[PDB]
Amino acid sequence: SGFRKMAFPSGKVEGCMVQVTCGTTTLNGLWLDDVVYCPRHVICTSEDMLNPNYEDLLIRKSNHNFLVQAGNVQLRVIGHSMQNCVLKLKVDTANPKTPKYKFVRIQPGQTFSVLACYNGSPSGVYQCAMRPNFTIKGSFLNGSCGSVGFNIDYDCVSFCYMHIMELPTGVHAGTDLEGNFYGPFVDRQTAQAAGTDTTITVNVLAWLYAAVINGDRWFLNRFTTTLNDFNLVAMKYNYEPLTQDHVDILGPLSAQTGIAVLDMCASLKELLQNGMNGRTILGSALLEDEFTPFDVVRQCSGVT
Amino acid sequence: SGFRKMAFPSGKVEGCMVQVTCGTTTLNGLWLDDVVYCPRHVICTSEDMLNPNYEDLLIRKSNHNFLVQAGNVQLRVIGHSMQNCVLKLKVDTANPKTPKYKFVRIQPGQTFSVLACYNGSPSGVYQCAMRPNFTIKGSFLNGSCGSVGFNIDYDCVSFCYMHIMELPTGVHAGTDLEGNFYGPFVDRQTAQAAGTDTTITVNVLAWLYAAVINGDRWFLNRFTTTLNDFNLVAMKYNYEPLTQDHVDILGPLSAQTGIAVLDMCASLKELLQNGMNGRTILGSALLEDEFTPFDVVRQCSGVT
C-alpha cells in the first residue's frame, strides 16, 4: 500500500566516504580498496576554476598536498593520478568496508540514489534520475562535490555518478566514476548550456501504471492511440519519443494491470492536452518521470 | 543549490534489523542490545487478526516459537514480553552494531526517516511526516511491518515509529517503540477511521521559505495578513491554525530571507484562495507540508 520515491539503503556507501582536502579546498571522496576517488577541482582555487590547465596545476601538487581523512584517521597518499575529470589517490590502506562494487556509466532516464555528504560525512540520501539532457535535480551545497550516485544489486554497488558542478539553472552535473562527464559539461566556472530537458515518457507511463496498481484510475480513458500519433503529441510537449523497446519494458506492468500500453499512452495524451483539472495522481498534481519501470516493479514486488 | 526531500543515512539502523517469524507470520524486528522489538501481531493468524485477545494468544506462544534471525544466524530467545502493541524478545546476544539510541514519541507535524524492510532486510529509505491525524503516507507491503521510523542527532538514533497497520485509505498507522499507537488506531482488522487530515501550515511556510532561498519567489505578494485573519482562511482550507510558537520557529528562516512570517502567510493565503495557475514551487504543482523548519534549515545549512 502506498508508493513513495525511495532511495537504496546507504550503509555500504556510507563506509566508503572520506574527507579530501587539497590546499584550501575540501570536498568528499570515495575510498574503495587502495584508491580514493575525488573531483579533480579540489586542486583548483577560485581563480584557477575560471581557466584551469589541470595538467599544469597537478604538476605543482604532490602526494603530501592531499589530506585524505576517514573519521579522525588520515590515510597515507602514495600516488596521484588524473583520469578524465576525477583524481585517483593511491593510499597505503585498503578500505576494510570496501563492498562488492562496479562502476557503471548510466543511460539517460535511468535512476540512482545520491548519498549527499559534507567533509566526508553523509548528510542524507535521495533518488535522482539522469535527465535526458544529462543534468540532475539534486540537493548539493559547497563541499558536496565528490558525493556519489549508486544503485545496489544485492551484494554489489554499481557506482554511476560523482557530483562535480552546479549549473545556473539550479540543477547539477557530474561524471561517471571513470571521470567522464554526463553531458557536454566541463569542470570550469563558465557559462554552461543545460539544453532542453525532455520528459522520460516511459518513466511517466510506469508511474501511471504504479498509480493504477495503487488504485488511482481517474486519468484512465475509454480509448487508445498509435505510437506515431502518440509521439506526435509527445513531441509538442517535449516528451521523449516512445519506442517499441520502451513498450516491451512496460510489459510486465501492462500485464499485471490488465491494461495495454497504448491505452495508457492515450490517457497520457489527454492528461497532456487537457491537464489534470486540479486533481492528483499518487499525491502529485503533475506527471512524474523519475520512476523507472524496474523502480515501480521493485516497490510493487517488495524487493530487498 | 536545489532542495529535495531527504532521508537520514540508514547505515546504523540497517545493522539493527532482524527477521522475526512466529508460526506462519514473518515480519521485521529491531535488535538493540539484548532485546528485539516487533509488532505483536506476528503471533496472530488471519482469523486471529479479526478479534485478537493478545493476552490469551501470547500465553500459548513460548520463546522457542519465536524465530529471530540476523543475516543467516539465529538468536536464542530467552524471554518474551508484550508492552502495549509491541513484543520485546530478550535474546542471548547483544547487537554489537547497537548504536547510541533513544526512543521518542514524536509530535504531529514532525518528520522522520523510514527504513522499509522485508524479512529483516532493508529495501529502501524515504522521508515521512506524522500527519496531524496520526496516519502516515509511506510505502509498506505485507511483511514491512516492524519497519521503523527514526531521526539521527550526530551519534544518537531517536527511534520514533514502528509500522504495524495499513488503513483502507492506502495510508499507514504504527506505534512508538514503547508500543503505543500514534492515533486512535488498534492492531485489529476492523474498519478504522482516518479522520480529517489537516495541512501542517508551519511546514508549508517553511517550504515556501526554502523556495525563496532557492530563488523561487513568484508566489510572493505585495501585502500582509494577521494571525486571526490568516487562520480564518486556514480553517476553510483544512490547515492547522498558525501559532506564535510556529512563528518563532519560522524565525531564523524569516530572518535569513529578509521576509516577515505574516507576509509569507499572505502569499499562502493567495495561493490557497486562487491556486497556482499551472505553475510550480520547487518542482511541485502543490503545497508541501512534510518539511519541518529544521528540515529546511538542515539542508540549507548542510548539516551532516
Within 10 angstroms of residue B236's Cβ, the number of other Cβ atoms is: 10
Burial status of residue A225 (CB atoms within 10 A of its CB: 0-12, 13-18, 19 or more) = buried
CA distance A230 to A24: 54
Could you tell me how many helices (H) and strands (E) chain B has, helices first? 9, 13
* Contact indicator for A292, A204 with CB cutoff of 8 Å: no
Interface check A299 vs B, CB under 8 A: yes
CA distance A265 to A268: 5
C-alpha distance from A127 to closest chain B C-alpha (Å): 9
- Annotated catalytic residue A265: no
3-state secondary structure chain A: CCCCCCECCCHHHHCCEEEEEECCEEEEEEEECCEEEEEHHHCCCHHHHHCCCHHHHHHHCCHHHEEEEECCEECCEEEEEEECCEEEEEECCCCCCCCCEEECCCCECEEEEEEEEECCEEEEEEEEECCCCCCECCCCCCCCCCCEEEEEECCEEEEEEEEEEECCCCCEEEECCCCCECCCCCCCCCCCCCCCCCECHHHHHHHHHHHHHCCCCCCCCCCCCCHHHHHHHHHHCCECCCCHHHHHHCHHHHHHHCCCHHHHHHHHHHHHHHCCCCCCECCECCCCCCCCHHHHHHHHHCCC
Within 10 angstroms of residue B205's Cβ, the number of other Cβ atoms is: 27
Q: In 3D, which of B40, B42, B41, B6 has the Cα closest to residue B23?
A: B42
> Looking at chain B from residue 267 to 296, which residues have their Cβ under 8 Å from any Cβ of chain A?
275, 278, 280, 283-286
Interface check A192 vs B, CB under 8 A: no
Helices A227-236, A261-274: crossing angle, 10 deg rounding = 30
CB contact under 8 Å between B299 and A2, yes or no, is no
Domain around B290:
201-301
CA distance A207 to A91: 44
Q: In 3D, which of B212, B165, B210 has the Cα closest to residue B191?
A: B165
Strands A121-129 and A111-118: antiparallel
- A47 φ, ψ to 5°? -65, -40
Interface check A166 vs B, CB under 8 A: yes
* Contact indicator for B151, B158 with CB cutoff of 8 Å: yes
CA distance B251 to B263: 13
Identify all chain B residues contacting A138, using CB atoms and an 8 Å cutoff. 2, 4
DSSP-assigned beta bridge partners for residue A112: A128
First-to-final CA distance of chain B: 16
* Contact indicator for A28, A20 with CB cutoff of 8 Å: yes
Strands A35-39 and A25-32: antiparallel
Q: For residue A152, what is its C-alpha cell?
A: 545496489
Where b means 16+ CB within 10 Å and e means fewer, B11-30 reads bbbbbbbbbbbbeebbbbbb
| Sequence letter at residue B49 | M
CB contact under 8 Å between A138 and B302, yes or no, is no
DSSP-assigned beta bridge partners for residue B101: B157
Identify all chain A residues contacting B140, using CB atoms and an 8 Å cutoff. 1-2
Q: In 3D, which of B183, B180, B111, B172 has the Cα closest to residue B147?
A: B172
CATH classification at residue B254: 1.10.1840.10
| Angstrom resolution of this structure | 2.8
| Sequence letter at residue A80 | H
Helices B261-274, B201-213: crossing angle, 10 deg rounding = 100
CA distance B139 to A267: 25
Interface check A14 vs B, CB under 8 A: yes
Helix (H) or strand (E) holding B156: strand B156-166
CA distance B281 to B217: 9
Indicate the DSSP class of residue B23: T
DSSP-assigned beta bridge partners for residue B87: B38, B82
Mapped onto helix, strand or coil, the DSSP state of residue B142 is coil
Mapped onto helix, strand or coil, the DSSP state of residue B230 is helix
Identify all chain A residues contacting B124, using CB atoms and an 8 Å cutoff. 6-9, 299
CA distance B41 to B185: 14
CA distance B167 to B180: 17
- A265 φ, ψ to 5°? -60, -40
**CA A168-A173-A176 angle, 5° bins:** 170
Cell 550526530 belongs to B154
CATH classification at residue B36: 2.40.10.10
C-alpha distance from A36 to closest chain B C-alpha (Å): 20
* Contact indicator for B34, B41 with CB cutoff of 8 Å: no
